[PDB]
Amino acid sequence: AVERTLIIVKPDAMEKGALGKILDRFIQEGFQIKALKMFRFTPEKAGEFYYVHRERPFFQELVEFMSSGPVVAAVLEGEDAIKRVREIIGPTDSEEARKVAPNSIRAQFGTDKGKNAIHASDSPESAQYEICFIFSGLEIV
Amino acid sequence: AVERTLIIVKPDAMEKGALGKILDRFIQEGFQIKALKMFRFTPEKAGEFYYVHRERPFFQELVEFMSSGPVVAAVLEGEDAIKRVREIIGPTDSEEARKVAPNSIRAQFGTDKGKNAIHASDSPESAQYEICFIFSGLEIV
Amino acid sequence: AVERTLIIVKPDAMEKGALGKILDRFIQEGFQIKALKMFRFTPEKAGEFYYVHRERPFFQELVEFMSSGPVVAAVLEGEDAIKRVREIIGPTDSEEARKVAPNSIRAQFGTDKGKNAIHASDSPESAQYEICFIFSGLEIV
Amino acid sequence: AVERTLIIVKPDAMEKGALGKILDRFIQEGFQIKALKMFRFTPEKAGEFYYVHRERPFFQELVEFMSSGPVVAAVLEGEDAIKRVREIIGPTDSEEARKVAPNSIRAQFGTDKGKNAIHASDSPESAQYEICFIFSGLEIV
């Protein structure tokens, strides 16, 4: 089905100058960008965004990194978007991405397992929460 | 339990100059305002917000009215907020509100059953939808 | 001439529950609210907003105070708005306001010369800067 | 000097899928993206954005086109940004751009003089107005 998912381009990929190349890739893969915004998470807001992950490994590291500089979020819409976007971005470990998916976003622009260029929603439930965390319905266009 | 609900001050109450009195009432009733802004629904966005009413009487008039001038929305937080806010605003029909709840928002500022000053979420599930329609998580402070 | 000015309801008045009463006053004084929202200054953003005061007494306390909790800003439009809004809010020193203007905003809701309930633009040029700092043209409705 | 300018990627380039390639170009040319947003101008808001141009040729055509689908605006910051961005985008007439500046944005993605892919501020005064029309200071990051 046609679905929406959230991506966030992380500060490592921002600093590498990869934003445009990353957006181009998703456009060329057939996704419609329905919302797009550069913003800066406060540490508190990054913590709230990652509320679910608060029990998973590296919560504080993630919150600190994701509030350490500006980021860009986008809502991507298309057939099977949640899974397809995950395939395009590649394995969480950027080094592993280079071994198994050389043209994935993380292979191309990621450094390691933490500085790995990009976030994407991992499920329908996460996508619903994450999209509303960043974008109101009024911002969808 | 502590809940969040959405109110929208409609263009009738806006034009009557009642916005401040309405906000004051909810503050004095013990609610925390977690988000607030003035915006203007396009007809398309008003229709999406009210999508549940699409097949009901006076839907087109509702959409036109709600997009006819700026409105102000607020997220209100407090114990039993959804039910308590609906008790404070009074019956949909502003005339009936004047009969049974003279100090309700609709009794005080509502004209009739359509131009009835204020919208509030009906239920937990509609509050979740409506809050996300108007406000992102980044706007809740 | 018709002018626009910016007000910010400061965290002291927010915590006192005065937001609605303050907005009501400006509505009743004949101003059009052209933009409105609740937000939270980061310390950095509060410092930029108040950059003119950077070398003045109590600047650090001003920045901390103004970033200590959410605030609400509004753009007010009307004839001679900049001067009239400053007459309505009263002297900076809330105690002096109680002596000379008992129904002024600062007399009614201000604590002292620092926690003085409300900010308003000083001049046409500062209004232009301050309005743009908080609100884009897209938010003026 | 280091300056800020506004670009808006117009609906023609949006529909061609050129957004990412356009942003990449400005990143590679050395500009910092300080704000970025996808939004939809209402006809009224496009008219206000182009207030200055309201006497120049093709006002209504421009307003209609710029409100006909979503657009993406960005604030670009860098040395001599206003002029350098204009050089990168090329002549207003996309056909002329192809003749004299084949790698300009308008040569690459523009169709003609109206569907010409991109807007950029034409002067310091225009940049100041245009940036504030789309982005508040709070949105600069």
Curated annotation (Swiss-Prot), chains A, B, C, D:
One Gene Ontology term, aspect cellular component: cytoplasm
Cofactor(s) essential for the protein: Mg(2+)
Catalysed reaction equations from the record: a 2'-deoxyribonucleoside 5'-diphosphate + ATP = a 2'-deoxyribonucleoside 5'-triphosphate + ADP; a ribonucleoside 5'-diphosphate + ATP = a ribonucleoside 5'-triphosphate + ADP
Subcellular location: Cytoplasm
Enzyme Commission designation: 2.7.4.6
Main localization, broad class: cytoplasm
Top EC class, one word: transferase
Keyword Zinc in record: no
Residue numbers annotated as active site: H119
Alphabetized UniProt keyword annotations: ATP-binding, Cytoplasm, Kinase, Magnesium, Metal-binding, Nucleotide metabolism, Nucleotide-binding, Phosphoprotein, Transferase
CDD domains: NDPk_I
Binding positions for ATP per the UniProt entry: K10, F58, R86, T92, R106, N116
GO annotation terms (biological process): CTP biosynthetic process; GTP biosynthetic process; purine nucleotide metabolic process; pyrimidine nucleotide metabolic process; UTP biosynthetic process
Gene Ontology molecular functions: ATP binding; metal ion binding; nucleoside diphosphate kinase activity
Function comment: Major role in the synthesis of nucleoside triphosphates other than ATP. The ATP gamma phosphate is transferred to the NDP beta phosphate via a ping-pong mechanism, using a phosphorylated active-site intermediate.
Family statement drawn from the similarity comment of this UniProt entry: Belongs to the NDK family.
Subunit (UniProt): Homotetramer.
Protein's name according to its UniProt entry: Nucleoside diphosphate kinase
Natural source organism: Aquifex aeolicus (strain VF5)
